[PDB]
Amino acid sequence: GHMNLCYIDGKFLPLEEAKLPVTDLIIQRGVGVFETISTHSRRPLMLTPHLKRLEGSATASSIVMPATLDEMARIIREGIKKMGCETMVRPYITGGDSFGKDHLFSSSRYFVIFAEIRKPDPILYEKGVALHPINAERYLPSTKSINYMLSFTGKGAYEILYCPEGEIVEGSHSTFFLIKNGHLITAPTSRALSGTTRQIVLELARRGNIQVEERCPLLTELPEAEEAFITGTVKELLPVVRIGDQIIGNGVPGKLTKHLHQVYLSSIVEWLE
Amino acid sequence: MNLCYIDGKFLPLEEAKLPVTDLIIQRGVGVFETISTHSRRPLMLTPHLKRLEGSATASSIVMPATLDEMARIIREGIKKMGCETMVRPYITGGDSFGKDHLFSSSRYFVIFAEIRKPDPILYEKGVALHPINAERYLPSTKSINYMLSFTSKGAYEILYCPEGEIVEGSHSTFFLIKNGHLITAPTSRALSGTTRQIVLELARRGNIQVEERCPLLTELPEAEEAFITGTVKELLPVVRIGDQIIGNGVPGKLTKHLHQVYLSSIVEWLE
Numbered sequence: 444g445h446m447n448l449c450y451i452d453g454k455f456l457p458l459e460e461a462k463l464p465v466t467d468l469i470i471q472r473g474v475g476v477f478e479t480i481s482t483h484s485r486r487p488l489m490l491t492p493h494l495k496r497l498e499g500s501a502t503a504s505s506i507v508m509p510a511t512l513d514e515m516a517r518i519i520r521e522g523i524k525k526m527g528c529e530t531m532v533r534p535y536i537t538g539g540d541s542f543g544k545d546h547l548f549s550s551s552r553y554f555v556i557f558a559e560i561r562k563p564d565p566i567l568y569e570k571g572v573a574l575h576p577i578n579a580e581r582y583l584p585s586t587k588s589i590n591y592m593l594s595f596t597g598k599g600a601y602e603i604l605y606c607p608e609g610e611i612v613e614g615s616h617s618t619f620f621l622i623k624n625g626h627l628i629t630a631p632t633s634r635a636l637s638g639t640t641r642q643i644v645l646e647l648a649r650r651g652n653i654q655v656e657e658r659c660p661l662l663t664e665l666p667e668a669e670e671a672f673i674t675g676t677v678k679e680l681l682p683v684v685r686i687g688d689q690i691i692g693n694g695v696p697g698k699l700t701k702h703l704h705q706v707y708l709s710s711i712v713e714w715l716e
Numbered sequence: 717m718n719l720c721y722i723d724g725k726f727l728p729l730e731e732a733k734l735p736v737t738d739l740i741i742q743r744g745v746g747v748f749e750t751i752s753t754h755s756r757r758p759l760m761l762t763p764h765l766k767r768l769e770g771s772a773t774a775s776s777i778v779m780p781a782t783l784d785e786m787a788r789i790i791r792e793g794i795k796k797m798g799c800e801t802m803v804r805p806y807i808t809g810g811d812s813f814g815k816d817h818l819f820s821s822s823r824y825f826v827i828f829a830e831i832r833k834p835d836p837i838l839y840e841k842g843v844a845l846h847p848i849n850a851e852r853y854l855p856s857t858k859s860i861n862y863m864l865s866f867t868s869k870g871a872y873e874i875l876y877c878p879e880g881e882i883v884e885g886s887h888s889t890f891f892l893i894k895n896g897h898l899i900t901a902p903t904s905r906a907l908s909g910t911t912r913q914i915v916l917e918l919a920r921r922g923n924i925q926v927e928e929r930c931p932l933l934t935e936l937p938e939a940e941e942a943f944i945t946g947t948v949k950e951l952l953p954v955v956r957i958g959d960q961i962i963g964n965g966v967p968g969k970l971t972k973h974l975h976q977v978y979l980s981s982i983v984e985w986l987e
C-alpha cells in the first residue's frame with residue numbers, strides 16, 4: 444500500500460496537509476464537480492471518459508477548466524505511479540473565489556486525491572443491499588457535482604434511490620438496474636447521470652444479447668422483478684435485494700446480476716488506459 | 717479588511733484555509749447564516765444563531781461550538797471591522813459521517829466582510845427573477861448548496877417555481893402583492909427568513925392581510941407588486957419574473973411603504 448496523496452498547487456502533498464482557501468465557492472456555495480476513477484492492475488479504468496465527463500460537469504456549471512484534460516491525465520498517471528498500489532483517484536474542480544459579470548467561474552482551482560481502493564465488504568455482494576426510495580430528483584443530472592447533502596439526512600438503507608412521482612431514476616451515488624423477465628431496465632441519461640460503469644454494463648448486455656430498456660423502472664413494477672443492482676466505478680455491480688418494504692424477487696442476489704459482474708471482471712482490461 | 721475566525725484566531729480572510737478532507741468540500745455538507753449590521757449592531761443575531769443550530773441539527777451535524785461562543789466570536793469580529801459588517805458563520809461536516817449517523821468532527825469558521833447592499837438603482841428600478849421548475853429539498857435548512865442558483869437573461873436571482881407554484885428565491889424570500897394582500901409561501905415550503913418574519917409582523921401591525929400560500933405563476937398578470945427579502949438586501953422590488961412584467965414594471969406603493977417601516981422599525985430586533 445501507500446500514503447494517501449493530494450495534488451494541489453503544482454505539488455503532491457500528504458493528503459492530511461492539503462488545504463483550500465475558505466473564499467472558494469465550493470465551500471461557500473457548493474460550486475464543485477468531481478470524478479471517481481479506479482485502477483485495475485494499476486491502470487485507470489475509463490480515464491478519458493471520466494475526464495470528458497469532468498469537463499462536461501464543469502462546462503454545464505459555468506466553470507472554466509483550471510487545467511487541460513491532458514494535464515489532468517498526466518497528474519492522475521504520476522499520482523497512481525507514486526501510490527504503487529490499486530488507487531481510487533478523485534479530481535475536484537472548484538468554483539474558485541468569484542462568479543464574474545460574464546456568468547463564469549474563471550478562477551477555478553483543482554486538486555486530485557489519491558487513496559487506496561476500499562471495495563464494499565464481500566458480505567454485501569453475497570447478501571445484497573437495501574435502497575430507501577424518496578420522492579425527489581437530481582436537477583442537472585448530467586453534472587457530477589459535490590452536493591451529496593440529501594444522501595446523509597434522507598431503515599438502514601445502503602443508499603437513497605431518487606423515485607420522483609414513483610419513477611426510479613438512480614441512486615445518490617449509483618446507477619440503478621432492474622432485471623424483469625431476463626431484460627435489463629435502467630433510466631435514460633436524459634434523467635440519470637451517464638455512468639461509466641452503466642455504459643460498460645450496457646455494452647456487455649449488447650454483447651451477451653440481453654435486451655436493454657432505457658426507461659425509468661416503476662416502484663409499482665418491483666413485485667414483478669427478479670433482480671436489481673446498482674453500479675459505480677468502485678462497487679462494480681452491487682446486488683439490491685430490497686427497495687423500501689419491497690423484497691426484489693427471492694430476496695438474494697440473482698443469476699443475471701452475478702453473470703454480468705463476472706463478465707465485467709473478466710472484460711475490464713479493454714477499458715483500462 | 718475582511719477577516720476569517722478559524723481555529724481560535726481572527727486571520728486576514730485571504731489566509732484562512734480548510735482541509736480538503738472536509739465533507740463540506742467533498743460532499744457539500746455545510747450550513748451557514750448571513751448576519752448583517754445596522755449602526756454596527758447585529759440584526760436578529762439570536763434568531764440567526766438559533767436557525768444555524770436548526771440547520772446543523774437537521775443535517776445530522778453536531779454543533780462544534782455553543783451559540784454563546786458563536787455570539788462572542790461574532791460580536792468581537794464586528795468590533796474589529798469597525799464598519800457596517802456582513803457576518804457569515806459556516807459549520808462543516810468535517811472529515812467523517814460516523815457509524816452513529818452523525819458528523820461528530822464538524823469544523824467552523826466565521827467570515828467578516830464590509831456590507832455590500834445592492835446598488836440603489838436596483839431599489840429605484842427593481843430587479844428581474846428567472847423562474848425554474850425545481851425546489852429546494854429540506855427547505856428549512858440553510859445549506860451551502862447554491863449550484864442551481866448559478867447555472868438567466870440577466871435575472872437578479874432564480875425563483876423556485878415547482879409545478880408553477882412560486883416558493884422562494886435561491887437566496888431570498890419572495891412576496892407577491894395582489895389586491896393589496898401580501899402572498900408568501902408557508903414555512904412548510906420556504907426557509908423561515910428572518911427578514912420574512914419581520915415583514916409579516918409589520919403587515920400584522922399595518923392591518924395588511926397576509927396569505928401564507930405559494931403564489932401561482934398564472935396569478936402574476938393579476939398582481940400589482942412583488943419583492944424579495946434577505947438581511948443584507950432588506951426589501952428589493954421585483955418588477956419582472958421571466959417574461960411577465962409585475963404591475964406597471966416599477967417599484968410599487970406597498971413595497972416602498974413596507975421598506976420605510978422596516979428601516980424605521982429595525983431598532984427593536986438589533987442586539
Ligand SMILES: *Cc1c(COP(=O)(O)O)cnc(C)c1O
Pocket residue numbers: 479587588613614615616617618636637638639640641674675676677
Ligand atoms: C458518480 C455517480 C454514479 C456512478 O458513475 P460511475 O462513472 O459508474 O462511477 C452514479 N450516479 C451518480 C448520481 C453519481 O454521481
Ligand SMILES: *Cc1c(COP(=O)(O)O)cnc(C)c1O
Pocket residue numbers: 750852858859884885886887888889907908909910911912945946947948
Ligand atoms: C438565507 C436565505 C433567505 C433569507 O433569509 P434572511 O434570514 O431573511 O436573511 C431566504 N431564502 C433562502 C433560500 C436563504 O438561504
